[PDB]
Design a protein around this nucleic acid. Structure first.
Ligand SMILES: [Mg+2]
Ligand SMILES: [Zn+2]
Lengths: 60, 76, 167, 114, 81
RNA sequence: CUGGGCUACACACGUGCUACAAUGGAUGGUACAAAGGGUCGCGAAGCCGCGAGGUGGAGCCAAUCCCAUAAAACCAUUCUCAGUUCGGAUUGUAGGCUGCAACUCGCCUACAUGAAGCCGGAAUCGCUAGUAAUCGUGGAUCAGCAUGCCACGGUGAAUACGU
């Protein structure tokens, strides 16, 4: 029961409070970072390749 | 005699319509009203008597505090 | 004195004209009252008995006489001569006075006083009121209030007690 | 003295608190309205404002009714059939907190295993 | 609405409770709105509140007023552990 | 799709928070940081409510404006070794905010109530210097909800013979 859900989230719900967020490369609803709209395990395996501009490993 | 605890006929009035009722009890009632000089018993504070009770003579919706009356005094 | 005044002034001729009695004293009249508490739960407690003693004394104006157990029954570990329950009798002038204090001060304080049906008569006329708490009393468990009348049946008692103003 | 033998040694601000219905804050407004100073020990009152103090408490609720009023409301919802009173009756937390662990003050001291 | 501009009686139940004045409260009202405060007009009517499994009939008294019409139908059934 | 449950409770375990007080509690005055966040956002001034908050709209796409009082520490008065002016759970009432909606099932405010607890057996854990201990601040997630999590600074030790 996933591809049904990713459709629902893109449909406007009856009351505005129901609206919520998911990653796009996945449907994962938990741990989405608002600035990039990506989950916590797309933002990792993707900022390695060098496609999230300006992001790098942080020694300090 | 002697065993019988203290007792005293007293005066009762309804606080809603002054329905005076002459009765008796063992209570002091901590009052003194000169009604019927020579029997100036203490009055006792009471609720609305059966002289004006809804079920008794005149049926009427009366709120006995709180419950249905607390709402009417804040939502309106 | 007010209740006797109303009874002899108006209630007596009212009953007489209702039933067309031969003489004056065939009219039913209130005869006695008995107050029972029934504290049978006092299987071993002692302060319960004494507390009921002052409670009923304050309600009445007389010392109650606690009653010894009629017989020893094992189902309630009841033994012979165990003082269980109390009784107080008001006769003469107390009869109307306690009634008045009940009906004008105590009875109106009943939360949902819808009265008892006419069915609760013994068939002779004597009526028992089963009151549910001691806090209804003006001064301050379940118990019974009986009424003894000179009525030959139940309907006459009903009409006279309604003449007194209560159901 | 005011309903109970409130301590003689304690200052009046503290001493009033022993009344059921007077804490640190209501006691302060009482002594401000009456006029008595806060730091008086009770053994050496004026006994004239003491008559004034009990005059004020006549207005405020005290141990007499507050004991019954709290009980006369807990005994209401336990009869109507509310969930809130159902918890009262069987001895469980009233407000909606959890009971997997850490509910002993309402539930009573922790019984042994079963 | 626990603020100063309440309360919340659902539009579904409020309309049905009003029109039940004709039936002399003989009929029942079956609504799933477990979130409507019992208005003073509700007194005397019966509501068939939902409870997860089946409706449970409640008879609105005078003293029930002020509470939410679902406060009397427990939703988890536990007995004697 | 509505309603319910993941939030149940005889009980057993793990990780944490607040405590049992005088190096302290309560009241009044009072100086000092950094790192952060903000445009379908941050929302000041003034006024009102004891309070949570309401109204109001200034300034800002920000080394410009806002969150934003740092709290411990310091100086005054008071309480006097007590189950208390310690401790704060549990409970009643009356309220505030978000959201179509706070009963199951939210966070917060005031008044009231005011429980166990008086340094904790077997046994077990962390830490070698701006470290342990102690006090506050910010952020993600987020309409709202943290005693968790990730970062930030304020005061700041004892001991290490030896395998
Ligand atoms: Mg959400
Ligand atoms: Zn993803």
């Amino acid at each position: 029961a996933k591809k049904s859900m990713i459709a629902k989230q893109k449909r406007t719900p009856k009351y505005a409070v129901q609206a919520y967020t998911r990653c796009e490369r996945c449907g994962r609803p938990h741990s989405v970072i608002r600035k990039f709209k990506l989950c916590r395990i797309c933002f990792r395996e993707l900022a390695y390749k060098g496609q999230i501009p300006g992001v790098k490993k942080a020694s300090w | 005699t002697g065993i019988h605890p203290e007792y005293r006929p007293v005066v009762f009035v309804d606080t809603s319509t002054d329905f005076k009722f002459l009765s008796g009890s063992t209570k002091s009632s901590s009052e003194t009203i000169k009604w019927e000089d020579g029997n100036e018993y203490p009055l006792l504070r009471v609720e609305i008597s059966s002289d004006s009770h809804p079920f008794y003579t005149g049926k009427q919706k009366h709120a006995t505090a709180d419950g249905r009356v607390d709402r009417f005094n804040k939502k309106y | 004195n007010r209740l006797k005044d109303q009874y002899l002034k108006e209630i007596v001729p009212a009953l007489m004209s209702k039933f067309n009695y031969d003489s004056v004293m065939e009219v039913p009249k209130i005869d006695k009252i008995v107050i029972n508490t029934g504290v049978g739960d006092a299987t071993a407690n002692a302060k319960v008995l004494d507390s009921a003693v002052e409670e009923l004394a304050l309600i009445t104006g007389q010392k109650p006489v606690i009653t010894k157990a009629k017989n020893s029954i094992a189902g309630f570990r009841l033994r012979e001569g165990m003082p269980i329950g109390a009784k107080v009798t008001l006769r003469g002038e107390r009869m109307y006075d306690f009634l008045d204090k009940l009906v004008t001060v105590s009875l109106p304080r009943v939360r949902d006083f819808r009265g008892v049906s006419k069915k609760a008569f013994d068939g002779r006329g004597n009526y028992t009121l089963g009151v549910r708490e001691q806090l209804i009393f003006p001064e301050i468990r379940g118990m019974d209030v009986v009424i003894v009348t000179t009525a030959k049946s139940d309907e006459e008692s009903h009409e006279l007690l309604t003449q007194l103003g209560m159901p | 003295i005011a309903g109970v033998d409130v301590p003689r040694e304690k200052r009046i601000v503290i001493s009033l608190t022993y009344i059921y219905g007077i804490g640190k804050q209501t006691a302060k407004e009482v002594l401000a309205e009456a006029g008595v100073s806060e730091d008086t020990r009770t053994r050496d009152l004026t006994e004239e404002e003491l008559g004034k103090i009990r005059e004020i408490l006549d207005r405020i609720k005290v141990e007499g009714d507050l004991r019954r009023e709290v009980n006369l409301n807990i005994k209401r919802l336990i009869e109507i059939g509310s969930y809130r009173g159902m918890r009262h009756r069987r001895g469980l937390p009233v407000r909606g907190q959890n009971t997997k662990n850490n509910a002993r003050t309402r539930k009573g001291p922790s019984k042994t295993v079963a | 609405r626990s603020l100063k501009k309440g309360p919340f009686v659902d539009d579904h139940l409020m309309k049905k409770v009003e029109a039940a004045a004709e039936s002399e409260k003989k009929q029942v009202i079956k609504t799933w709105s477990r979130r409507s405060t019992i208005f003073p007009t509700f007194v005397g009517q019966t509501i068939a509140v939902y409870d997860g499994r089946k409706h449970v009939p409640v008879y609105v008294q005078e003293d029930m007023v002020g509470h939410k019409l679902g406060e009397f139908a427990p939703t988890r059934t536990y007995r004697g552990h």
